[PDB]
Amino acid sequence: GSHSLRYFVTAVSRPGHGKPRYMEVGYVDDTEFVRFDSDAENPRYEPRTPWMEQVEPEYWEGQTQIAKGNEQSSRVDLRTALRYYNQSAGGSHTIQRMRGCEVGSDGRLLRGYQQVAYDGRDYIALNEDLKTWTAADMAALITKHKWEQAGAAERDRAYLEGACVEWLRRYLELGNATLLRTDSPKAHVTHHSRPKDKVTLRCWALGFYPADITLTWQLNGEELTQDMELVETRPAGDGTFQKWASVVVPLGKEQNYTCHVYHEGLPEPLTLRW
């Protein structure tokens, strides 16, 4: 498969109410594994999975120091943006950054990411070539120039192609048991009679990982789109995911509809009927 290591950074100003709130979150493959929270009684990077607890203590202190530098920086950034955009004082504003690498099963870099949003909108992003920037606006053009002049892109390229990839591997081998597992969905169909002569068929998928799944309903032998609902895929909170798709069909015609569940952890897709 392909895997990714990703860092998500949030800074939120709260004028009058003290210094900005600041957070960093690390993800391996969409599992949260490290976190830095300024609200902590004693803020610092900490492990978020049992498997992260086995790394050298040298690991943490260093990363904590890096996060603290990021937090002081981000506080300056919030002030900077207010100035670039000429925004009124006294409101809350947010900076977000995502940076990470996505690597194919051959250990090669498929993609490196470096991007920033201000107040929830694209601000600046490192292009796929890992050498040039895309500024979303006038304000971001000032950062683009600063960053070119400071040789930021090359610092980022080096990290994304080297360290980012190298640590992904440590982490993968570290959380071995649980990161690479597959839990296939357990499926079933429920049945409900609504007004007039309608029946709701709900096709359920539970306890699966990874999150990626497809559920479809077929009438006679082709898929449906109207009379259908599917909920966004959701965490059970224990590392598995849930989804369902329902369809409304005529009463006494339930037997003509089948539900199909597609998931990598299945020797082949599931077919259910009421």
Binding site: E24, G26, Q63, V116, W167
Partner: peptide
């Protein structure tokens, strides 16, 4: 591993 971020 996280790195340090460039100022805006």
């Amino acid at each position: 591993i996280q790195q340090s971020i460039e100022r805006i």
